[PDB]
Amino acid sequence: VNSFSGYLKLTDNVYIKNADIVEEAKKVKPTVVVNAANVYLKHGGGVAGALNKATNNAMQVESDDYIATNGPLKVGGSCVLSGHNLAKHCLHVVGPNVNKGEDIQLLKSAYENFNQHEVLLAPLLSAGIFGADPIHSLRVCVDTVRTNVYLAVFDKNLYDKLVSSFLE
Numbered sequence: 001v002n003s004f005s006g007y008l009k010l011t012d013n014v015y016i017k018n019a020d021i022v023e024e025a026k027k028v029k030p031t032v033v034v035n036a037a038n039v040y041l042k043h044g045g046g047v048a049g050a051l052n053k054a055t056n057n058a059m060q061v062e063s064d065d066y067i068a069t070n071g072p073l074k075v076g077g078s079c080v081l082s083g084h085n086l087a088k089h090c091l092h093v094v095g096p097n098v099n100k101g102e103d104i105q106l107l108k109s110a111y112e113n114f115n116q117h118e119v120l121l122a123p124l125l126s127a128g129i130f131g132a133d134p135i136h137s138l139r140v141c142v143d144t145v146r147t148n149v150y151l152a153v154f155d156k157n158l159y160d161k162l163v164s165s166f167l168e
């Protein structure tokens, strides 16, 4: 139903909210929820771990089956799997892990995947354990994505930094 509420306009197609993406997915019933995945689709922490836990491991079992056919995703790549109880679809996107020296230029590639979907509930890509500056990631999102993005940021302090950087 894509019943988004309380999202702040950043650009005509990028909105942001201080919220837990799992709780958003349950309220919003989005067509697409984006996971911040790794190449092995192993949902062991951060957004991925949260989304998987909210599916009671339905997402991890489906992810294992895909990886059985595909082998690992490429950095900057994506796949579309079931959203289970969270969404119609989950778009698993692999941003670069800058801690492992993966090129930050692949962040644009990662966000380009969003352009295959009209409306998405998403996190910022390559933030947290992937080591990219989250405000940088928001700039790449805004520059790259032309479809409608509703970004969920869990931490209030980071949310206020992002909004201050973007609008002040």
Ligand SMILES: Cc1ccnc(N)c1
Residues within 6 Å of the ligand: 019, 020, 021, 022, 046, 047, 050, 154
């Ligand atoms: C634990 C956790 C980390 C990041 N985003 C969330 N929604 C939840």
